[PDB]
Amino acid sequence: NLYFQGMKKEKVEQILAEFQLQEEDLKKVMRRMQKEMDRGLRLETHEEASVKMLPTYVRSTPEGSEVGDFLSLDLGGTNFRVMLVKVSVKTKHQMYSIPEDAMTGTAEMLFDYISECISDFLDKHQMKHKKLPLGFTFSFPVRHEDIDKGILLNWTKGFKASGAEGNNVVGLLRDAIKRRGDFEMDVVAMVNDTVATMISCYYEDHQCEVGMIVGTGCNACYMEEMQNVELVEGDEGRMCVNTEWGAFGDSGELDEFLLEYDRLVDESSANPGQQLYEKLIGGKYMGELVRLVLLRLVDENLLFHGEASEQLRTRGAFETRFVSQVESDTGDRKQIYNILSTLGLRPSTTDCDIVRRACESVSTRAAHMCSAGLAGVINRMRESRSEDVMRITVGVDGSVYKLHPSFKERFHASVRRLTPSCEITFIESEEGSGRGAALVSAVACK
Ligand SMILES: CS(=O)(=O)c1ccc([C@@H](C[C@H]2CCC(=O)C2)C(=O)Nc2cnccn2)cc1Cl
Ligand SMILES: OC[C@H]1O[C@H](O)[C@H](O)[C@@H](O)[C@@H]1O
């Protein structure tokens, strides 16, 4: 019965319409983000600011860098990456899966693991004896005192290792290295992944002064005028600021836009009440948002005969990669069918179409919300600079931006609508977070 199949779809659409954000909604978000950014930069309001605008101590500096071998560490997904880079060739690269116990255990365990992975890598390439300059991409909010010293403000993205928050991260790393005592490293720089991504792209294209990650988490950094970074002495040149925009909304700034699914995701997360804007966008949460929408549709007898399988009712079962796979479906529904069948469902073609619409609704909202953030930053920059038309390059990494079949296109379109009088070039970084840490280390070394 097509009429009834059709009636189901119309009811689904009414439910999914909740995810829509009009252009004026996005402008509001953008303005509110810019407001929060202003607040993070100012001494008077930094402590209260949800968007921390953390100085990175990465500065505009004359051309050039030290040459040779640099080790780069990259922590901030569940995979830890070690990279040898010769200044530039990524001579060698190894990725290591972080055990469950290390991400939610003690900082000692986490950093012991990291140190072990480093010895493994140094062994695979017979260079454990060589004392190397090391750049550390550490993808969490850090309050820096310098390029090589900064305290972890709080874990995000489900990290929970005790004894890390409030401590110098470079010290934690150094301590773990010393405890193992089988190699030595000169940790010269610690940067955020947004920062590393920007640096890696900047190397290729000097117009790159913004980095953005849309991966497990979502964040951005940009080159701010020193005169605007009240938290650091000096008015000359530029310094990269790590926005930590994922925490936008943590003070209520997004309340009118948060849906029931968002509340649910937030409440089941490792950091309830935190990173709310990130929870609208990041790959850690996207598949779960879809899962909750699907459960709602099942509850309304709109999907899967009103029955959800064990798998569909399993936390994290609807993987963000499935959202990407569903929206990649060519129209034969074959990809969608296979995902849902593996989730223990017996989907009809209508079921498949509805799941497609759910995915599109969540991912479009993610794209649009993300666009308001980036537009806020770029518009801010254009204003801070003398600029009628600002031509700028944004370096981007992260599986959501890179792998989702239509996120990038929706995101770009929306950003462009919100940034007239800007000309934004987007570059997808290759090795960005790893390569960027080595590059910053080479510059920090000179
Ligand atoms: C000429 S360069 O490509 O070697 C280069 C120089 C400058 C820098 C800066 C960071 C860039 C990023 C965007 C921007 O406008 C400046 C750098 O490495 N700065 C730095 C490094 N260490 C300590 C303090 N500052 C990086 C790089 Cl790869
Ligand atoms: O990994 C992308 C982002 O994830 C989270 O938002 C982290 O707090 C931030 O530091 C990082 O840049």
UniProtKB/Swiss-Prot annotation:
Effect of Y203A: Increased glucokinase activity based on measure of catalytic efficiency. Increased affinity for glucose. Loss of inhibition by GCKR. No effect on affinity for ATP
pH dependence: Optimum pH is 6-8 with glucose as substrate. Optimum pH is 9-10 with glucosamine as substrate.
Cysteine-cysteine disulfides: none
Superkingdom per UniProt: Eukaryota
Chain intervals for the UniProt region annotation (Hexokinase small subdomain): 63-191
Pathway: Carbohydrate metabolism; hexose metabolism; Carbohydrate degradation; glycolysis; D-glyceraldehyde 3-phosphate and glycerone phosphate from D-glucose: step 1/4
Enzyme class: transferase
Effect annotated for changing C221R: In MODY2; loss of glucokinase activity; loss of affinity for glucose; loss of affinity for ATP
Effect of G68R: In MODY2 and PNDM1; decreased stability; no effect on glucokinase activity; no effect on affinity for glucose
Catalysed reactions, as listed in the record: a D-hexose + ATP = a D-hexose 6-phosphate + ADP + H(+); D-fructose + ATP = D-fructose 6-phosphate + ADP + H(+); D-glucose + ATP = D-glucose 6-phosphate + ADP + H(+); D-mannose + ATP = D-mannose 6-phosphate + ADP + H(+)
Keyword Nucleotide-binding among UniProt keywords: yes
Keywords, in A-Z order: Allosteric enzyme, ATP-binding, Cytoplasm, Diabetes mellitus, Disease variant, Glycolysis, Kinase, Mitochondrion, Nucleotide-binding, Nucleus, Transferase
Effect of E165K: Small change in glucokinase activity
Annotated phenotype, changing D148N: In MODY2; decreased glucokinase activity; decreased affinity for glucose
Role: Catalyzes the phosphorylation of hexose, such as D-glucose, D-fructose and D-mannose, to hexose 6-phosphate (D-glucose 6-phosphate, D-fructose 6-phosphate and D-mannose 6-phosphate, respectively). Compared to other hexokinases, has a weak affinity for D-glucose, and is effective only when glucose is abundant. Mainly expressed in pancreatic beta cells and the liver and constitutes a rate-limiting step in glucose metabolism in these tissues.
Protein name: Hexokinase-4
Organism of origin: Homo sapiens (Human)
